[PDB]
């Protein structure tokens, strides 16, 4: 039972600097190492720097170098990351990993060849200068268009948010089947919006009422807006 | 230092063989390590070296390689085995990682549900105008979906997302997002978005009149 | 303006410990030093670029290098343990700046295996329908512990609040886990564990709700 | 000798205001500026201004101007900071320091703008969160070991003494926890001679001064 | 290419000896001891292959850092076993504080607890199996600056700073006198049981104080075992150790003399190991008996 503990989720306005902790456990940090990989939102994995516990040694990716340093604290087996000066392309999710504790030594690493094994649950990272915001919520009432026989579909518009994330929930009568919930995409402006909808059976929609209940916990919002159909 | 895998998005069902190829643009010897990635959870080590896989890994990983090229085998897909791979080069301390490989359930070929719903009232008086397209409960993940305002079509006023997959039927669900100003929504009266998919025989479009 | 410092430094006591400031043409401005020992008010200990004011010891040296100020602390103490902040002032707005601050750890400590000291509800939590297992891990360092419980040596993730270990008076850490349960949960099981593994090393105690 | 000592520390709910004295003595408290620097539990010093200790005037960090005032008393050389509309993020320990002299420049180097002496910090506490008693619990045990759980408190500090008083050498209090319900708990252990059972009645004292709450719990080993 | 003598883990000749120790009253460890020597020779292999030259002696810690991986790999298996060791702990403690059934209990759980270790060999093989080919390549990687004229510091450094130290420890302590004393409790617990049990009749405590002598001779056995071992390893380690290190060696003989001492520190540690652990284990049933001997009291 060995862990990589990591801090709480940050968000940075653009040029600010963060560091983020990843405290290990359970194991003898001192004779190991720590890396550290990034994950763009959407994106794959990008590596970013090694740090060991037991030179205290380092090396740094070359695009992040001079704007990152790691340091450890084996007192406490903690090990730091601080990227400084952030930039919008910074916004990602950061993870740490346990490596081993030469990794760009001198020659050969032939000693331990295990790659990464143990991570971290991760922390993501949110470099924007856009402002706390509620999100805006309007209904996607179904019509003519929308319904095409005995089944017929029907939502809601959770849009300009900052940050995330927010949560849908339709009364939940209805959430337990059929609920389509689409991820954010973040816009131009720098605020969020995404669409949550649902699929009923046409005889439903003249007895069965629709609300929506909307929650964004940073702002402490929350919506309840109702979805009816419109006399098109 | 330059890593690229084979398969971007591969569909394979429980019980097949799966193989992903990781070529590389240098040499490494036997330094790569495999990983398995569930989308929202972090990493998880899988083989390192060569075939040499951590403790607690399904007997049933495996890898092959030298050089620029190597290769990961699932001899028999089980349902937790469907998320992303990446491979990692270690060769020199300057890491470098894979494009990703996503392992995706494959089922029966099913169209779209088509849904298209004009800008509330609400939203048409804070002076923005979205009209959301719908494509709901789908296989393949590939599908096409074009606006056009007038009959003419449109390009970057508009953003798409889709949902993973479903946990019980296992189809995709897409949001095709159009926005633009009251003042130039006002410009215009029909709103049409085509969707082309492969198990559409001729394209779907969904319109409606301001 | 940003002051840029390194989060942690770890030393050998005995031997120096050197914290930098980096920050856009630092050289011309005058950067002071403070010392914050936990749970204590910063003490000014390096005021000019290499001035230490009056009880300072010789040992706490400050310098200005190019683009970016040291404070190096020669001969390390155990009591030289504590956060270093360093403090410049900006012509442009007036305003007195702080850096991101520096824990200094005295690294001189042997390993120790913790202490597991594992209390069952007592008779008046569960006369008032509750039930708290406490897990008491004492004298151990490094300061990090994994705390795991079990239940018929199943893994419990419901109730468990852990403490972060805090260094003791004796320079060893300390933690305390709590793992909440309702009467009928914990005379359901035949014994609950609680788990610390530290440095690859597993301590275990267990706990049976015995009649 | 220079001293700067500050007001106690204090809980308030947000929207309220606080005052947050220092009391200065050993100089000439108008001839030395006065400066307020803030730090969050776990974090950095912020500084958030100084004020000229003779005129009166102060001056604020950016975004620190509008719910902070600082106000002087020099009659009794002391030196005030108000803050008013209180949010959560205020919840942070102030530093009131005395500012040595400084020595400007046409380029803009200078002799020092540094905080000589500080005061020891006054912690504000910000949070809706109401005021509650603990529940005390005995924890019945070559050695034995016999503790109190303190649960459910808040908010700090909550103190343990054992025989009022009489056993203070072989007491670990152990740090409280921050419960997911924002309550906090912490428990204290005694170690225990293997035949000392039966000896000294061991009651723990618990006092929670923030609810006035006085607990004292004997510790006696399960009947059956 | 040479002739290790830790090399095969699955030849079904000679049996997987599993040691149970039980130090503090409440909990419970095995050890196949195979494994555990095939390991630690492996161990000694690798520090003596990077300590032999100079430029390779910094990467000890990587070293540390995989010897721990793969201790930290065993352990994992060790686990899959603690269900059954789990049953067998609270058998033990209802046991120690019906004796047909109770007794039918122990027998099963013992039984299943090693059925458990047959189960999991193929883990504990590869985990043990990735040892040994990291130790072989290490140790086939091992050069010389003159083949004809080897060092052999590493030999000496790696015995002053890993080995020296149990050797004295081990000549520290009298195993012999504490093997003496050990029989001398044993003597004593039988003769105040075949004294006790002569007459007066109280099922439940005369069946415990039996159950925990068999127990305590069976760990007094092991102990013995352990001891020998480590009298004759050390006067042969120490004897050997000697002439492996003022000199200089062709490189073949350097080998054989590196394999040797490796496999002797294997033995050596391994029941050294084992006999601290039985030691605290044969002192830990005796506290036992101490207090059923003493609650026999009629009042």
Request: aromatic share 12%.
């Amino acid at each position: 039972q060995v862990q990589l503990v990591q801090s709480g989720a940050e968000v940075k306005k653009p040029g600010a600097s963060v560091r983020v902790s990843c405290k290990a456990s359970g194991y003898t940090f001192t004779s190991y190492g720590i890396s550290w990989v990034r994950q763009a939102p959407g994106q794959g994995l990008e590596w970013m720097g090694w740090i060991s516990g037991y030179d205290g040694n380092t090396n740094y990716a070359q695009k992040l170098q001079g704007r990152v340093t790691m340091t450890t604290d084996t007192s406490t087996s903690t090990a730091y990351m601080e990227l400084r000066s952030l930039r919008s392309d910074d916004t990602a999710v950061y993870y740490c990993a346990r490596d081993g504790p030469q990794v760009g030594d001198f020659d050969w690493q032939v000693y331990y060849y295990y790659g990464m094994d143990v991570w971290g649950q991760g922390t993501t990272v949110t470099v924007s200068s856009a402002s706390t915001k509620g999100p805006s919520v309007f209904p996607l009432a179904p019509s003519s268009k929308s319904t095409s026989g005995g089944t017929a579909a029907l939502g809601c518009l959770v849009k300009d948010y900052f940050p995330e994330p927010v949560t849908v929930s339709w009364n939940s009568g209805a959430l337990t089947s059929g609920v389509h919930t689409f991820p954010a995409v973040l816009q131009s402006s720098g605020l969020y919006s995404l669409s949550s909808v649902v699929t009923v059976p046409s005889s439903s929609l003249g007895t069965q009422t629709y609300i929506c209940n909307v929650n964004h916990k940073p702002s402490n919002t929350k919506v309840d807006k109702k979805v009816e159909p419109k006399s098109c | 230092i330059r890593m690229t895998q084979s398969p971007s998005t591969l569909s394979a069902s429980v019980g097949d063989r799966v193989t992903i190829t990781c070529r590389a643009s240098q040499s490494i010897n036997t330094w790569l390590a495999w990983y398995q990635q569930k989308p929202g959870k972090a990493p998880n080590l899988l083989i390192s070296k060569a075939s040499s896989l951590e403790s607690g890994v399904p007997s049933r990983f495996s890898g092959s390689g030298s050089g620029t090229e190597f290769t990961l085998t699932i001899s028999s897909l089980q349902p937790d085995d469907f998320a992303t791979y990446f491979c990692q080069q270690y060769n020199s301390y300057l890491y470098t990682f894979g494009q990703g490989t996503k392992v995706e359930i494959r089922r029966t070929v099913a169209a779209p549900s088509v849904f298209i719903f004009p800008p509330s009232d609400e939203q048409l008086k804070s002076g923005t105008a979205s009209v959301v397209c719908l494509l709901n409960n789908f296989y393949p993940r590939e599908a096409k979906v074009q606006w056009k305002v007038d009959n003419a079509l449109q390009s970057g006023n508009s953003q798409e997302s889709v949902t993973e997959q479903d946990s019980k039927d296992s189809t995709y669900s897409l949001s095709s997002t159009l926005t633009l100003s009251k003042a130039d929504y006002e410009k215009h009266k029909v709103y049409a978005c085509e969707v082309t998919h492969q198990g559409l025989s001729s394209p779907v479009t969904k319109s409606f009149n301001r | 303006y940003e002051l840029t410092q390194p989060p942690s430094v770890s030393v050998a006591p005995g031997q120096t410990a050197t914290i930098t400031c980096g920050g856009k043409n630092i050289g011309s401005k005058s950067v002071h030093w403070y010392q914050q020992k936990p749970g204590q008010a910063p003490v000014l200990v390096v005021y000019d670029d290499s001035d230490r004011p009056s009880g300072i010891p010789e040992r706490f040296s400050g310098s200005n290098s190019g683009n970016t100020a040291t404070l190096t602390i020669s001969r390390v103490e155990a009591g030289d343990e504590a956060d270093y902040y360093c403090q410049v002032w900006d012509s442009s707005s007036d305003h007195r700046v702080f850096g991101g601050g520096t824990k200094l750890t005295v690294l001189g400590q042997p390993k120790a295996a913790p202490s597991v000291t594992l209390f069952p509800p007592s008779s008046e939590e569960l006369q008032a329908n509750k039930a708290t297992l406490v897990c008491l891990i004492s004298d151990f360092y490094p300061g990090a512990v994994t705390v795991a419980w079990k239940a018929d040596s199943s893994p419990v993730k419901a109730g468990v609040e852990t403490t972060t270990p805090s260094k003791q008076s004796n320079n060893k850490y300390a933690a305390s886990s709590y793992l909440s349960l309702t009467p009928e949960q914990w005379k359901s099981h035949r014994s609950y564990s609680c788990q610390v593994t530290h440095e690859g090393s597993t301590v275990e105690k267990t706990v049976a709700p015995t009649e | 000798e220079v001293q700067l000592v500050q007001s106690g520390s204090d809980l308030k709910k947000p929207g309220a205001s606080v005052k947050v004295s220092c009391k200065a003595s050993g100089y000439t408290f108008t001839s030395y500026a006065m400066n307020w620097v803030r730090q969050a539990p776990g974090q950095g010093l912020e500084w958030v201004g100084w004020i000229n200790t003779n005129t009166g005037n102060p001056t604020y960090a950016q975004g620190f101007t509008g719910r902070f005032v600082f106000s002087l008393d020099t009659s009794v050389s002391t030196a005030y900071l108000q803050i008013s509309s209180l949010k959560a993020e205020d919840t942070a320990v102030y530093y009131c320091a005395r500012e040595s002299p400084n020595y400007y420049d046409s380029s803009g180097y200078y002799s020092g703008y540094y905080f000589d002496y500080w005061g020891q910090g006054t912690l504000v506490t910000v949070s809706s969160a109401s005021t509650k008693g603990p529940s005390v619990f005995p924890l019945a045990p070559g050695t034995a070991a016999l503790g109190c759980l303190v649960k459910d408190y808040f908010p700090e500090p909550v103190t343990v003494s054992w025989n009022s008083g009489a056993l203070t050498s072989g007491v670990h209090t152990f740090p409280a926890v921050l419960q997911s319900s924002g309550l906090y708990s912490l428990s204290s252990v005694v170690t225990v001679p293997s035949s000392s059972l039966g000896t000294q009645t061991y009651i723990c004292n618990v006092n929670h001064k923030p609810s006035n709450t006085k607990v004292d719990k004997k510790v006696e080993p399960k009947s059956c | 290419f040479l002739q290790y003598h830790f090399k095969e883990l699955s030849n079904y000749n000679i049996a997987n000896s599993i040691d149970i120790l039980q130090e503090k009253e409440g909990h419970l460890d095995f050890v196949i001891i195979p494994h555990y020597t095939f390991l630690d020779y492996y161990k000694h292999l690798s520090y003596n292959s990077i300590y032999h030259k100079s430029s390779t002696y910094g990467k000890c810690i990587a070293v540390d850092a995989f010897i721990k991986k793969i201790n930290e790999a065993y352990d994992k298996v060790k686990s899959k076993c603690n269900d059954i060791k789990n049953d067998l702990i609270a058998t033990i403690k209802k046991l120690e504080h019906t004796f047909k059934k109770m007794m039918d209990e122990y027998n099963t759980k013992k039984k299943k607890l090693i059925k458990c270790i047959k189960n999991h060999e193929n883990d504990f093989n590869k985990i043990c199996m990735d040892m040994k080919n990291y130790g072989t390549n290490l140790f086939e990687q091992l050069s010389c600056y003159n083949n004809n004229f080897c060092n052999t510091n590493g030999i000496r450094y790696h015995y002053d700073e890993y080995i020296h130290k149990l050797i004295l420890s081990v000549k520290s302590k009298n195993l012999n006198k504490d093997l003496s004393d050990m029989t001398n409790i044993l003597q004593q617990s039988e003769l105040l049981l075949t004294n006790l049990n002569k007459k007066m009749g109280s099922y439940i405590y005369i069946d415990t104080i039996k159950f925990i002598h068999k127990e305590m001779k069976h760990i007094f056995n092991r102990i013995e075992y352990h001891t020998k071992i480590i009298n004759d390893k050390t006067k042969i380690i120490q004897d050997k150790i000697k002439l492996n290190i003022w000199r200089t060696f062709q490189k073949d003989e350097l080998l054989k003399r590196i394999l040797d001492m490796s496999n002797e520190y294997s033995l050596f540690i391994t029941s050294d190991h084992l006999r601290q652990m039985l030691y605290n284990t044969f002192y830990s049933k005796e506290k036992h008996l101490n207090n059923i001997f003493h609650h026999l009291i009629y009042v």
